[PDB]
A paper describes a structure:
Queuosine (Q) is a hypermodified RNA base that replaces guanine in the wobble positions of 5′-GUN-3′ tRNA molecules. The final step in Q biosynthesis is the reduction of the epoxide precursor, epoxyqueuosine, to yield the Q cyclopentene ring. The epoxyqueuosine reductase responsible, QueG, shares distant homology with the cobalamin-dependent reductive dehalogenase (RdhA), however the role played by cobalamin in QueG catalysis has remained elusive. We report the solution and structural characterization of Streptococcus thermophilus QueG, revealing the enzyme harbors a redox chain consisting of two [4Fe-4S] clusters and a cob(II)alamin in the base-off form, similar to RdhAs.
We subsequently repeated protein preparation, crystallization, and crystal harvesting under anaerobic conditions, leading to significantly improved x-ray diffraction. The anaerobic QueG crystal structure contains 5 monomers in the asymmetric unit (AU). No obvious differences can be observed between the individual molecules, with an r.m.s.d. between monomers ranging from 0.1–0.2 Å. Electron density for the three redox cofactors is well defined, with the corrin plane located at the bottom of a deep surface pocket, providing direct access to the cobalt ion from the solvent. The cobalamin is bound in a pentacoordinate, base-off form by a nitroreductase-type module, similar to what is observed for the reductive dehalogenases and the distantly related vitamin B12 processing enzyme CblC. The closest Fe-Fe distance between both [4Fe-4S] sulfur clusters is 9.5 Å in QueG, compared with 9.3 Å for the S. multivorans RdhA. In QueG, high levels of disorder can be observed for a loop region connecting two of the cysteine ligands (Cys-184 and Cys-187) to the first [4Fe-4S] cluster, suggesting the possibility of ligand heterogeneity for this particular cofactor. One side of the active site cavity is markedly more hydrophilic compared with the opposite face, and consists of the strictly conserved D100-Y101-H102 QueG motif in addition to the conserved D130. A putative salt bridge network is observed between D100-H102 and Asp-130, the latter residue pointing directly toward the cobalt fifth ligand region. Tyrosine 101 is located adjacent to D130 and similarly points directly to the cobalt water ligand, although neither is close enough to establish direct hydrogen bonds (both at ∼4.0 Å distance from the cobalt water ligand).
Residue numbers in the entry: 1 to 370
Write the structure that this text describes.
């Protein structure tokens, strides 16, 4: 007894910015739309595939009785700007500044569980953060962490949407928290700011057209999204920056600004090894360097950076990574606005190895009236 007050006490003790409680009752109100996302092809592929495991918490535990939702806030503005150099910089979502949230939160949930082991008997748990089967977002709503916006995210009054979420499924009998009075209203800002219009209106999405996805999808980024990621080479925050509830927050926790706003051409020099050493700790490193270097080439093209030309030419001639080659060929068509005869001969004189490079090459050629 007074576990709920005791938990809350040790929560804030170990850096958890908010905590909530809810039943292990299933979530079949979601079924309908989860299944419709998959059938309509609006799913990314990152989602847990088994829909049953997604809505029935007992499939993850059995002895499930309550679920404890945690939230850890993160800064969205940079404490200290990075220092101007020769090299232009891209941006990379604050969701991925500093240590990979997955590790941070799993550590916090471990501590919370160890601190509960002491104050009861027969305690049973199952921790999740992002990579688990539950809908992290809907759990935090039932637990009154915040409400789900039209942008799909969980929004708190206190810390905005700039929170990482987690869950500790458990066999404890505990008083559910309330939920929240505040919502969206007739706000619509996010819906109108999304540069792809992926958001459907009801907190639901064609994720396939989210730029956050596009920056993480493997392969060749479709033409439409290249221009639109501007210089943001990982994630998208547009639907949160445009949100009233984020209007005036700064939040607590360590950030290297050079990892948060990386210099692009030096970034393109990284190997698997140097990439691991320097970037391996952030969330955005979970698929390796290649998707990021592709994106960086795109950023350089979006900046029309004449200083990248020689590097792009090196990527193309070496051709050890075809996605990069094809992206670079495109990038030259963007950067070199008035090509000299020498450049027309360079371009005319490539004969792309593979189909994606061939495709991008044909387009530049056509654009340059070759
Ligand atoms: C797959 C995934 C993605 C994909 C797909 C995004 C998406 N919206 O589905 C991509 C790569 C695009 C993505 C992007 C981002 N994501 Co992500 N993503 C996930 C992941 C692993 C699973 C997503 C999932 O379960 N799909 C849910 C889809 C299928 O459901 P749906 O049909 O849209 O359902 C919506 C409705 O049911 C609605 N719903 C619930 N309550 C209510 C109430 C009412 C009345 C109504 C009508 C509807 C409604 O909410 C659901 C979505 O939130 C989750 C973690 C997790 N396991 O939950 C993180 C998660 C959702 N992502 C997270 C983050 C931070 C992001 C980004 C902000 C990262 C960035 N800065 O770029 C973006 C923003 C995109 C966005 N607008 O949601 C955080 C959200 C943070 C928060 N505080 O809410 C989560 C919770 C991870 C975490 N542990 O923090 N993500
Ligand atoms: S992250 Fe960007 S692209 Fe994705 S929904 Fe939000 S605004 Fe739209
Ligand atoms: S922008 Fe407005 S509509 Fe969108 S989530 Fe924020 S509050 Fe809701």
């Amino acid at each position: 007894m007074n576990i709920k007050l005791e938990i809350q006490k040790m929560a804030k003790e170990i850096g958890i910015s908010k905590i909530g409680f809810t039943t292990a009752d299933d979530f079949d109100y979601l079924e309908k739309s989860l299944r419709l996302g998959v059938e309509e092809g609006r799913t990314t592929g990152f989602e847990h595939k088994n829909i049953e495991e997604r809505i029935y918490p007992k499939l993850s535990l059995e002895s499930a009785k309550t679920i404890i939702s945690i939230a850890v806030a993160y800064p969205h503005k940079l404490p200290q700007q990075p220092q101007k150099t020769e090299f232009k910089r891209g941006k990379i979502t604050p969701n991925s500044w500093g240590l990979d949230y997955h590790y941070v939160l799993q550590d916090k949930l471990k501590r919370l569980a160890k601190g509960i082991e002491k104050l009861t008997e027969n305690f049973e748990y199952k921790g999740m953060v992002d990579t688990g089967a539950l809908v992290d977002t809907a759990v935090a709503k039932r637990a009154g962490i915040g409400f789900i916006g039209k942008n799909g995210l969980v929004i708190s009054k206190e810390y905005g949407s700039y929170m990482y979420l987690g869950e500790l499924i458990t066999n404890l009998e505990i008083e559910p928290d309330q939920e929240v009075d505040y919502g969206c209203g007739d706000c619509r800002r996010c819906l109108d700011a999304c540069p792809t219009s992926c958001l459907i209106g009801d907190g639901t999405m064609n994720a396939r057209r989210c730029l956050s996805f596009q920056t993480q999808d493997k392969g060749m980024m479709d033409m439409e999204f290249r221009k639109k990621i501007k210089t943001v080479i990982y994630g998208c925050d547009i639907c949160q920056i445009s949100c009233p509830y984020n209007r005036g927050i700064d939040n607590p926790l360590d950030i290297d600004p050079d990892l948060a706003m990386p210099e692009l051409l030096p970034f393109l020099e990284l190997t698997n090894k140097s990439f691991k050493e320097t970037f391996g700790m952030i969330a955005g490193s979970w698929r390796g360097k290649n998707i990021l270097q592709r994106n960086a080439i795109i950023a350089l093209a979006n900046l029309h950076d004449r200083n990248a030309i020689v590097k792009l030419m090196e990527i193309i001639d070496k051709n050890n990574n075809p996605i990069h080659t094809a992206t670079a060929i495109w990038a030259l068509g963007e950067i070199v606005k008035k090509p000299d005869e020498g450049m027309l001969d360079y371009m005319r004189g490539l004969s792309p190895k593979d189909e994606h490079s061939q495709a991008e090459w044909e387009l530049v050629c056509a654009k340059w009236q070759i």
